[PDB]
Amino acid sequence: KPVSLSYRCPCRFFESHVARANVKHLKILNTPNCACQIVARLKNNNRQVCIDPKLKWIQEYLEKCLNK
Amino acid sequence: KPVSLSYRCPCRFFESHVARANVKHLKILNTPNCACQIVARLKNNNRQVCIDPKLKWIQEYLEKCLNK
Amino acid sequence: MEGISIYTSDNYTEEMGSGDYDSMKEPAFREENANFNK
């Protein structure tokens, strides 16, 4: 799939107070239109939520994978 | 399919010099026996590579996504 | 800082589910509660 040029984001809406303990992973796509877009998929097999990159648990998440 | 879960790391190796312009997105998982697990899919199927959390642009990537 | 440099990404899809868990708030940056989890 040839990636084209247009201001779009994967997720247009973000989830906010989702449980960091209930997600399995994050997937980050920074698209020209959005600050930073993170998509997370819940444990077992449940819904997928797109998260705001500025969530406190994300604040913890990014900073800890960075420096600690 | 049932959820046959185990404690594993997705990838085993990490790339510390992948081209930030050649990648499309990042996949981040917190693994049990591995620090931070990031894997990225390149533009088209060259191969998908596993990324080093300690990679320079990853540092900058995470750092900026925290607020911008 | 090359981590802000845009890469060509489009024609990819992720399906919008629903804005559910608050779905519109932002950081408190650090600890919100000292220790009163109980």
Added chain:
Amino acid sequence: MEGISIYTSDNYTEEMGSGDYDSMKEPAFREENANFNK
């Protein structure tokens, strides 16, 4: 941090790679120089 616990990062099926471009270094925290391209 709030998130110290590990999640079930299992159920992942791709074609795992190995060392490709470099694959063994550490960060410089931030900047190799504060943008010295010119």
